[PDB]
DNA sequence: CGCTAGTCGACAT
DNA sequence: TCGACTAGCG
């Protein structure tokens, strides 16, 4: 996500206790107790061997939002988005080479070494993320697959009025524009809330609280999408926007050096990444859950071309995106692995 | 001070 | 995977 971003707004947060939104829905980035959850059992998935640790993990947190009167809504990540299937494969070459050399750490005699090199392999699965669908949808608990990347999704529920707040790790939420994230919770509900109208708060963040200021921000500093400029932090291009009276963003950033007094060359291919960068972050393709249709994060615009936005995810059709989130079609091969139907008895 | 890139812990015995 | 945390550099 955004580096730093949180001790970036630290004014803007809170901690409280998930109580607070009892009586209301709550979505959950599931891939974060799914990622925890197998450190417990990295060494079985590692090698292969059967186990369901992380199932258990994922169950007790969902049981504690249950016994707190919350309604969570289960949230698992889908396709790989097209512009991020080398950085996918790149990680998953290290996850491949902790793997091979953790193995021959225990080789060596070494374990606790060795422990640290599994748990940096850990890859979940969409098995693995099905496995805490079945548990999860046993208990009464919704469940749903976004199309692509749970941050988009996420970000979808709590701009609708489905969810009030998200349970996360990751800053990509904040980005993205969700109105209360909820980070760093643990087994019993204590968390860290962050508001959108609460980033007022942060003094050194200026007049860049408006959400289209504070996306270019989170951009220009880094992200999955598009890496910053060598010297260009979460600072610098905070000054940028605060210091640039412009709303063109785009020659805001071919005047960069001159808001900042540095010596800056902008290639040309960067600010074609920088549009791709925001109509990802804009228009990922989520899944409606009440329409039951594949739709962009937020309404296109009258200025954008909707033809020219492949690498935030191509449509389908809509009842195969309808399956897809349902858990029972597999998104590698498309096949029916499961036959989940919940209207007969979001 | 700000930014880069690297280290390291997470879980739970 | 994602963050917190730090030495090193402008
Ligand atoms: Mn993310
Ligand atoms: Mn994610
Ligand atoms: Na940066």
Request: proline share 3%; with cysteine.
């Amino acid at each position: 996500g955004i580096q730093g971003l949180l001790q970036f707004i630290k004014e803007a947060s809170e901690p409280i206790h998930v109580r607070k939104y009892k009586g209301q829905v709550v979505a959950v980035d599931t891939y974060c107790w799914l990622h925890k959850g197998a450190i417990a059992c990295a060494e079985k998935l590692a090698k292969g061997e059967p186990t369901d640790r992380y199932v258990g993990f994922c169950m007790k947190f969902v049981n504690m939002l249950l016994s707190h009167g919350i309604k969570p809504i289960l949230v698992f990540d889908g396709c790989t988005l097209p512009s991020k299937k080398e950085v996918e494969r790149s990680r998953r070459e290290r996850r491949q080479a902790n793997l091979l050399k953790g193995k021959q750490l225990l080789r060596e005699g070494k374990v606790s070494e060795a422990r640290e090199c599994f748990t940096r392999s850990i890859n979940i699965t969409h098995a693995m993320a099905h496995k805490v669908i079945k548990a999860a949808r046993s208990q009464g608990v919704d469940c749903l697959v976004a199309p692509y990347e749970a941050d988009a999704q996420l970000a979808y529920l709590n701009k609708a009025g489905i969810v009030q707040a998200i349970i996360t790790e990751d800053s990509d939420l904040l980005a993205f524009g969700c109105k209360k994230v909820i980070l760093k919770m643990d087994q019993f509900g204590n968390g860290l809330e962050i508001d959108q109208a609460r980033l007022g708060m942060c003094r050194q963040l200026g007049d860049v609280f408006t959400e289209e200021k504070f996306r270019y921000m989170c951009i220009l500093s880094g992200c999955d999408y598009l890496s910053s400029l060598r010297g260009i932090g979460l600072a610098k291009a905070c000054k940028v926007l605060r210091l640039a009276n412009n709303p063109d963003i785009v020659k805001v950033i071919k005047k960069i050096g001159h808001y900042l007094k540095m010596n800056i060359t902008v290639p040309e291919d960067y600010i074609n990444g920088f549009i791709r960068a925001n109509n990802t972050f804009l228009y990922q393709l989520v899944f409606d859950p009440i329409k039951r249709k594949l739709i962009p994060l937020n309404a296109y615009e009258d200025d954008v071309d909707p033809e020219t936005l492949s690498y935030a995810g191509q449509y389908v059709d809509d009842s195969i995106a309808l399956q897809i989130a349902l858990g029972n079609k597999d998104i590698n091969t498309f096949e029916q692995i499961d036959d989940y139907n919940p209207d007969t008895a979001l």
